[PDB]
Symmetry: D2
Subunit: 116 residues, 4 copies
């Protein structure tokens, strides 16, 4: 899987389930074009967003709808969303895992990049 997203909840010590994720790619005209979307599973993971053929060099944005997640739990959170912007595949195809660890007033994110 060339792009996978994993989301964890630091308040409950659980995967963050049913979180909406939207991925965009920067187009020739410098606008964000929709690329893929989905929701995290019971394991906090979102697989199957793209394929190796479609996931070309470019600048991508992964936007995680953290606000809806916290509001459904009864918490008014600080951020509107958590997003990650990165260049992908500029030295050839790679596999990317984007992980995010969420709290109401904080988030942490890391990337794991592997060469298949």
């Amino acid at each position: 899987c060339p792009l996978m997203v994993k989301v964890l909840d630091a308040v409950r010590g659980s995967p963050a389930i049913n979180v909406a994720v939207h991925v965009f790619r920067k187009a020739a005209d410098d606008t964000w074009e929709p690329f893929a979307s989905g929701k995290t599973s019971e394991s906090g993971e979102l697989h199957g967003l793209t394929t190796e053929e479609e996931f070309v060099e470019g600048i991508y944005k992964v936007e995680i709808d953290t606000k809806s997640y916290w509001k459904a739990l009864g918490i008014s959170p600080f951020h509107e969303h958590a997003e990650v912007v990165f260049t992908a595949n500029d030295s050839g195809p790679r596999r990317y895992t984007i992980a995010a660890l969420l709290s109401p007033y904080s988030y942490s994110t890391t990337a794991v990049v592997t060469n298949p």
Copy 2:
């Protein structure tokens, strides 16, 4: 100081000095309009971005040019930038500190609202 930004470097254990920070506010047309900018000081801090009168309720984005910071240290980083998007002052002025802890492939951010 209604809005302060503090940036720390997790590789060197130091403030992140001379990092460019741009602040935007969301305009009626769902576009990001420039609002303030600066570069962090020797303590990793950026003060004096705005005043209580100008800092009204709304949606703000703080964008930190992390890529230029790591390139200057000879490290190839993952992110194009680190950004933080939040609603402020929806219930009137407050004091906001946005902190960011940087590594080449990761960042953490928190808000201290007092």
Copy 3:
């Protein structure tokens, strides 16, 4: 697997491979008794530390030898190790994932606790 450890490297964007992990359990006399040890695999994961029968209620410490890891990469790090101390299984058996994200002067850790 009742106890799994996952270790990631925030400098290189990779799993932290070959990291030593030592687990201890607090004994009746308030000393730390050795419980299990291992090293992380190529995926940054350490499985097979214990079994459901051996992993009883108690206070456990997971100690990750981050110092050796960074020194092998040429970096003199701040911490002597990263450790996590927690009570386990006090409301019945659970499955624990302890994750750590490492940098030379910082670490983050989270737990994911699931009810099998």
Copy 4:
């Protein structure tokens, strides 16, 4: 101030106030001897733990009583405490800030050495 501790709360977006902090130094017999302690202030900070003369090279542990903090807010936390173990001053005095960002099932810590 050669050693300062700052503690932040990621759930409420605030300093972590009135948190107990104990500092230990490793003794010749590989035992932890008490060295300093205090509780964080309204800004989440603990100053005045030690002096330059007393703070010699060695191995120190900072232990933060996170469990009592979350219990006071009615949240059941994962960790017994958060602790940070490091070597100081091996090349003579420096100024150390140990920061910790707390959530019920997670903590992050960094050091700022200036």
